[PDB]
Each structure stands twice: as C-alpha cells, then as structure tokens.
C-alpha cells in the first residue's frame, strides 16, 4: 500500500459533495417574487429589471 | 357611445331606470340633470389636467351642455365613464347601485388611470451636487458636476 489508498473514498466522498453542491448553484432557480399576472396587469415593462 | 345623451342612456339602463327592456320611457329633465351631473363629475375627474386625463371635451361657458354634444372620449373609456355616471346617479332616483356595477366602475376607473400613472411615473434628474464621474468623457467639458433639477 502507498498513500493514496485510504484516502479514496474521503476525496470521491468530497468530489460528490462538490458537485452536489455546484449543481444546486446552477440549476436552482434564483430569488424572484411570486405575483399573479393580474397584479401587474399593465405594469409588466416595471419589473424587467430597468430602473428607469 | 357616441355622445353625452348615449353615456346617459347607457348609464340609465345600467340601473334599471329609464330602458326598453322594462317598457320605462325617459324624461328630457332626467336627461338635463344626468348630463349636468356628468360634466360636474368629468371636471371632478380632471381638475384642469392635474387629475385623469379622459378625453372628454367640457361644453364653454357661454353654451350649456347639451345631449347632442360628443364626448370626445377614448373607445376604451366609454365603459368606465357610463358606469360611474350610474354610480353616481343613483342616490337621484332613491336606488343604491349593485354591487357589480360598483366594482365595475372602480376597475373602469382604474384603466383609465392606469396609462396617465404611467406616463406620469417618471424619475427626477440627478441632484445639483452630484459629480458627474472621471468616466464621462463630457468632464473635459468643465461639467463635473450635474445640472440642477
């Protein structure tokens, strides 16, 4: 045995947990509110993202 | 619809006061009095173009309005316009409007403001002791600093 065999399953362990991790970075869908589409009926060039 | 009469007969047969469908005929004074009430309630409205704008046209001084006369409004203003003056003269005729044709007027009222909120949304300039950043190219014009409002 040399010195990297007792240390697999804590890297493959760690490499998941990184990737869980980055997936729920990237697929999660961000923080946006929750409005009905009548509630903005009219007013829906007000929430694109301009602050004008 | 057209004119002034029709946003009255309109709003008349709405409260159940003065339609075909129950044989009711008119009376030209309910007319005079409905017609003055609208125009007091479009002035209301507009408070000379500090309030709603509608489009309706006011009758001048020298001549009284009239059931003849166009209104002037939009075609998506109509509804809203008949529909208050309904609301509005209901209390005439000893009668309280239904409920549907309170909220009807409301959400016609609120279209109506709807656009003129708008326009009228509009942001201030920036302030007069805001420095105009090394970033604008303009700055080598003296104007490091914002125009007042």
């Given at each position: 045995?040399?010195?990297?065999?007792?240390?697999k399953?804590?890297?493959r362990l760690?490499?998941?947990?990184?990737?869980?991790?980055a997936?729920?970075?990237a697929?999660?869908?961000?923080?946006?509110?929750?409005?009905?589409?009548?509630?903005?009926?009219?007013?829906?060039?007000?929430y694109?993202?301009?602050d004008? | 619809?057209?004119?002034?009469?029709?946003?009255?007969?309109?709003?008349?047969?709405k409260?159940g006061?003065?339609?075909?469908?129950?044989?009711?005929?008119?009376?030209?004074?309910?007319?005079?009095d409905?017609?003055?009430?609208?125009?007091?309630?479009?002035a209301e409205?507009?408070?000379?173009?500090?309030?709603?704008?509608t489009?309706?046209?006011?009758?001048?001084?020298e001549?009284?309005?009239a059931?003849?006369?166009?209104?002037?409004?939009?075609?998506?203003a109509?509804?809203a316009?008949?529909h208050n003056?309904?609301?509005?003269?209901?209390?005439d005729?000893?009668?309280?409007?239904?409920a549907?044709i309170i909220?009807?007027?409301?959400?016609?009222?609120?279209?109506?403001?709807?656009?003129?909120?708008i326009?009228?949304?509009?942001?201030?300039p920036?302030?007069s002791?805001?420095?105009?950043?090394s970033?604008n190219?303009?700055?080598?014009?003296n104007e490091?600093?914002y125009?007042?409002?």
């Open positions: 045995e040399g010195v990297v065999r007792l240390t399953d804590g890297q760690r490499n998941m947990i990184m990737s869980f991790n997936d729920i970075v697929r999660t869908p961000k923080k946006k509110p929750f409005f009905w589409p009548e509630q903005i009926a009219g007013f829906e060039h007000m694109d993202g301009n004008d | 619809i057209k004119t002034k009469g029709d946003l009255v007969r309109a709003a008349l047969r409260l006061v003065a339609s075909d469908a129950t044989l009711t005929d008119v009376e030209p004074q309910s007319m005079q409905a017609v003055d009430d609208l125009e007091a309630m479009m409205w507009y408070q000379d173009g500090k309030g709603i704008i489009g309706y046209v006011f009758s001048d001084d001549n009284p309005p059931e003849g006369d166009d209104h002037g409004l939009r075609s998506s109509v509804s316009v008949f003056l309904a609301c509005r003269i209901a209390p005729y000893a009668l309280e409007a239904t549907k909220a009807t007027a409301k959400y016609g009222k609120e279209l109506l403001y709807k656009q003129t909120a326009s009228r949304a509009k942001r201030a920036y302030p002791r805001m420095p105009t950043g970033g190219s303009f700055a080598n014009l490091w600093h125009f007042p409002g």
